């Protein structure tokens, strides 16, 4: 019940209570073990526990499948510092160590109770008698597939062995399966469900990408008479809410063209708000110095350029639209990590959208020349189309983000451009259409 999981959360993990109620529900669903569970949570949300704590409670050994050996080793070390009885059979062991591990596995009451195996070694010929003994023994209790998204062709990563993991799942049917992905799209979710032969009832536990204390709004650089003036007003307002409070935290401003990023930083500085370019081309010493002066409060706002974190971020303002809605959502995610309300601005532009679309098309053409990962190119084009629709579309911005990422529609009573002032959005899109 609840008491057992709570005890585990404190004795072996150290946490007093679950970070979020959603993962509490997910972990209890896995513990019940009635049906296959698909948990999609961001990194640092504790998704690991959703397969780790149930395994700590599982009657028998849990087989975890991860793409790379290095990730398996990192998880093994994290489990070992907690003194948990974890093992790995990836052939990483020498001869004697492999013999000992096989001897513990083959005998009853296996000492290993969570085994990290790359799919190759699970489907390797030599390991088949061991797996047959495991199933016949009924030792396997959970069949976790970490980074399950690698099975889906439309995902950013592809794993050919995760396809045969579906047949593996078809074997050892008596045990449930837990599929985990850092981020999930409904199409990717469908691919995961189909390829892994999971049971038809699947418990999907997905974090709502919606964030109450985030304000989402979009403006069209053609409509606004002076874009830098709007950027300055936004920066001032977000940075300083009241005279007594004074400037707080720091802002972020993404931009694709570095030549434009330096210009934006210098223009902001000249207007009155200091900014530091932090463009990737800059030398390592200078980039470190900038990242530092931003961590301290000396620098008000930092221009991310291609690449970026701080506890409080007053605002994010994309001078240019992002390549993919996943990228834009991640970039805006660091907005307002603190409780206080923040803001997220997208200065969507037809010319910039055309430029980045052409760049995406050229990249897809190069990929096709490679003759591989065609589904990846299709997914990238689909994501860019989704982002441009998001900027164009009339309606609740949070709702469109939820539609793309597939989580439920959010009830943002406050903190959305459309909901609060639909007439303003109507007028703005009418002006944009007239301009175009």
């Amino acid at each position, epitope marked *: 019940p609840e008491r057992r999981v709570r005890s585990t959360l404190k004795k072996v993990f150290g946490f007093d209570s679950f970070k979020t*109620p*959603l993962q509490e*529900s997910a972990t209890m669903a896995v513990v019940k073990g009635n049906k296959d569970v*698909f948990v999609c949570m961001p990194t640092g949300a504790g998704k690991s526990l959703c397969y780790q704590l149930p395994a700590l409670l599982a009657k028998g050994i849990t087989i975890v499948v991860s793409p790379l050996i290095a990730l398996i080793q990192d998880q093994v070390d994290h489990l070992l510092t907690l003194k948990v009885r974890v093992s790995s059979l990836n052939s990483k062991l020498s001869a004697q160590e492999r013999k000992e591990l096989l001897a513990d596995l083959e005998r009853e009451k296996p000492q290993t109770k969570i085994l990290y195996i790359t799919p190759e070694m699970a489907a390797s010929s030599s390991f088949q008698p061991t797996l047959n003994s495991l199933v016949s023994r009924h030792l396997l209790s959970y069949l976790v597939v970490d980074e399950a998204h690698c099975v889906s062709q439309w995902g950013h990563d592809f794993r050919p062995d995760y396809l045969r993991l579906g047949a593996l799942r078809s074997r050892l049917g008596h045990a449930p399966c837990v599929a985990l992905t850092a981020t999930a799209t*409904p199409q990717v*979710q*469908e691919d995961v*469900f189909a390829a892994l032969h999971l049971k*038809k*009832p*699947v*418990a*999907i*536990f*997905k*974090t*709502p990408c919606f964030r109450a204390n985030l304000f989402y709004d979009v403006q069209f650089k053609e409509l606004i008479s002076d874009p830098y003036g709007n950027l300055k007003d936004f920066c001032l307002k977000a940075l300083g809410q009241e005279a007594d409070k004074g400037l707080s935290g720091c802002g972020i401003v993404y931009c694709r063209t570095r030549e434009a990023c330096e210009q934006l930083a210098i223009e902001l500085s000249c207007r009155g708000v200091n900014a530091k370019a932090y463009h990737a081309g800059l030398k390592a010493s200078e980039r470190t110095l900038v990242q530092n002066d931003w961590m301290e409060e000396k620098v008000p706002v930092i221009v991310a350029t291609i690449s970026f974190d701080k506890a409080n971020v007053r605002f994010v303002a994309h001078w240019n639209i992002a390549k993919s809605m996943a990228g834009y959502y991640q970039e805006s995610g660091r907005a307002g990590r603190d409780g206080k309300p923040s803001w997220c601005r997208l200065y969507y532009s037809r010319n910039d959208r055309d430029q980045v679309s052409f760049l995406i098309r050229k990249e897809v053409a190069k990929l096709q020349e490679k003759r591989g990962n065609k589904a990846s190119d299709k997914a990238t084009i689909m994501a860019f189309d989704a982002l441009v629709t998001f900027c164009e579309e009339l309606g609740c911005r949070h709702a469109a983000i939820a539609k793309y990422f*597939g*989580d*439920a*529609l*959010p*009830a943002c009573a406050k903190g959305c451009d459309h909901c609060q002032n639909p007439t303003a959005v109507r007028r703005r899109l009418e002006a944009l259409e007239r301009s175009s």
Partner: nanobody
Amino acid sequence: QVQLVENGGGCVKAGGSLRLSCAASGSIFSINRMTWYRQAPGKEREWVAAITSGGSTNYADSVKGRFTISRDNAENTVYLQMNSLKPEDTAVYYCEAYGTYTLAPTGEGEYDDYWGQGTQVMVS
């Protein structure tokens, strides 16, 4: 859960037409495919119509000419209109609603498939 309800079942003479309705209640993010199954007395279930995402329609070579399937995703409703009905199609009709994906503002969801109770059609 999702409550599928059939409607429009009627007894039409040979040559006439009648429409069937299949509305999916509950909160559904999307549906993979709604398929109208036809089952007669003393016979194996036979597949009649299928509507998938994007409006793709799959029929039976013989049954294709008579029936037409049309779905609305926003409404979550699929209509199977029967034209030039024949005395052979005297079977009960069901919906499959294969691959139903449901979710809540919290985050909990399900991906099970749900079946409608059924609608009857008799032909002179």
